[PDB]
């Protein structure tokens, strides 16, 4: 049959709605598992075992090229060539200046065009969580006593497009939709928006973000005769990133180890893939487990214009009306 192939990586994630107010995912909008009688597959010749014959100086390819099954709601999916995009290092004197560059990057995070008339919202570097953990972790360390470093990178594994018409919605969403009243009711419609999102993905990119923040006891660091860059470079090296106390730091697996380099906390913000994880181990794990790192999206009510249930139009105008109020 056709079921022997793994699905296109990330297909379950691209199927989810998005809430722009909460900046988190909602339940599935698209049916991610629907194939509809058709066996479409995608060749991946970006992740094969290279061979090297040292005797003849021959660096050649393994015939271990894979096929992935593309579900009906994905019009296209293209695996990218994996590449290191450059690893950034930043240093901050205080939590706020880090928080600031972070939230500023949440304004770098979103663009917009308007169809010829639906908004098309454009998330770039999108994390799919409220960062409530991260914000509360960091707020433990908003004191003059602490300084911060941050390494960040981003990799895309694929670009995809969703289908534009005869969309098959998730059984969950369909049932919810059936249950919405024809008579406008903000409560019922807001609930639906809370369950399925303010927006759904029409295209995007799979991949990940590899990112760590270090919190550092400045006073302790000085005493050790080291610097914030020393610490970061040592931490970097522990992650496999190519460039006494450091040796003692190791991977910073213990608090003992971390305190050898004045490191109070290692805060992870890694997304996609998978203590800490090594750069190369993270890169591997992005083959099979990406997130939708960048995407285009449209208002939830737009999808009702393009489903296989056909004309669905007073629920659509109620949903739009409701979304107008919800977004304010």
């Amino acid at each position: 049959d056709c079921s022997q192939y793994e699905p296109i990586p990330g297909s379950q994630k691209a199927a989810l709605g998005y809430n722009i107010l909460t900046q988190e995912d909602a339940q599935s909008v698209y049916d991610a598992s629907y194939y509809g009688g058709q066996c479409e597959t995608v060749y991946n010749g970006e992740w094969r075992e290279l061979r090297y014959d040292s005797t003849c100086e021959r660096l050649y390819y393994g015939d271990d090229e894979k096929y992935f099954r593309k579900p009906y709601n994905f019009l296209k999916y293209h695996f990218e060539a994996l590449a290191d995009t450059g690893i950034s290092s930043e240093f901050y004197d205080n939590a706020n200046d880090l928080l600031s560059k972070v939230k500023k990057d949440k304004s770098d995070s979103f663009g917009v065009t308007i169809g010829i008339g639906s908004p098309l919202l454009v998330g770039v570097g999108v994390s799919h969580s409220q960062d409530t953990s991260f914000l509360n972790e960091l707020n433990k360390y908003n004191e003059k006593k602490f300084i911060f470093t941050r390494i960040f990178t981003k990799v895309q594994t694929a670009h995809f497009k969703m289908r534009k018409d005869d969309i098959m919605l998730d059984e969950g969403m369909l049932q919810s939709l059936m249950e919405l009243p024809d008579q406008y009711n903000y409560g019922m419609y807001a609930k639906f928006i809370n369950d399925y999102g303010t927006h759904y993905i029409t295209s995007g990119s799979m991949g990940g973000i590899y990112e760590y923040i270090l919190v550092i006891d400045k006073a302790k660091m000085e005493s050790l005769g080291i610097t914030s860059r020393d610490i970061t470079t040592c931490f970097g090296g522990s992650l496999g990133i190519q460039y006494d106390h450091c040796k003692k730091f190791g991977g910073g697996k213990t608090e003992r180890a971390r305190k050898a380099m004045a490191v109070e906390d290692i805060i992870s913000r890694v997304r996609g893939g998978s203590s800490t994880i090594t750069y190369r181990s993270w890169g591997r794990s992005l083959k099979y487990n990406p997130v939708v790192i960048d995407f285009e999206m449209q208002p939830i009510h737009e999808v009702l214009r393009h489903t296989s249930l056909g004309p669905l139009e007073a629920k659509r105008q109620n949903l739009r009306r409701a979304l107008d109020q919800y977004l304010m």
């Binding site: 090297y52 005797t55 100086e57 890169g283």
Partner: protein, 159 residues
């Protein structure tokens, strides 16, 4: 049959070598060569990184070279034949002649810098003739377009 350099010093052999030429009855080589660099470190007493392109992209190959003579090494793979590497002649500081024997052999000339001297080159051609290879079967590798690094997705790590 081929003897390793007497008293081969892995420590002085360490560092970066440029592939200059290979003598070989390899079917592959007789039918686009890439600039190839070797990075050598003794590990115990040798870790060997080869950098070179494939279809415009830089790769790092990691291997290990450890049997108990000096300039004789065992390279292991998948269902490949094991390869014996012999560092037959080198001055540590300008050139090196390595022999690789699978089953029934290639002779490689490396240098620390280019150009190689006339005498290093003649001596290599003489060895190739003595390995029952013709001048036809000497393939010279490029002198530019070296890979200074490979990213983490383009490391083929056999270690």
């Amino acid at each position: 049959t081929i003897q390793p350099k007497a008293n081969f010093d892995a420590q002085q052999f360490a560092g970066t070598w440029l592939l200059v030429a290979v003598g070989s009855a390899c079917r592959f080589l007789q039918e686009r060569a890439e600039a190839t660099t070797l990075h050598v470190a003794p590990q115990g007493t040798m870790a060997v990184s080869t950098f070179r392109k494939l279809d415009g992209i830089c790769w790092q190959v990691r291997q290990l070279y450890d049997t108990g003579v000096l300039g004789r090494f065992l390279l292991q793979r998948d269902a490949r034949g094991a390869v014996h590497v012999v560092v037959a002649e080198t001055d540590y500081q300008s050139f090196a002649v390595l022999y690789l024997e699978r089953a029934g052999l290639s002779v490689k000339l490396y240098a620390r810098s280019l150009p190689v001297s006339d005498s290093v080159l003649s001596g290599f051609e003489q060895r190739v003739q003595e390995a029952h290879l013709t001048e036809d079967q000497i393939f010279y590798f490029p002198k530019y377009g070296f890979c200074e690094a490979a990213d983490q997705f383009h490391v083929l790590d056999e270690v």
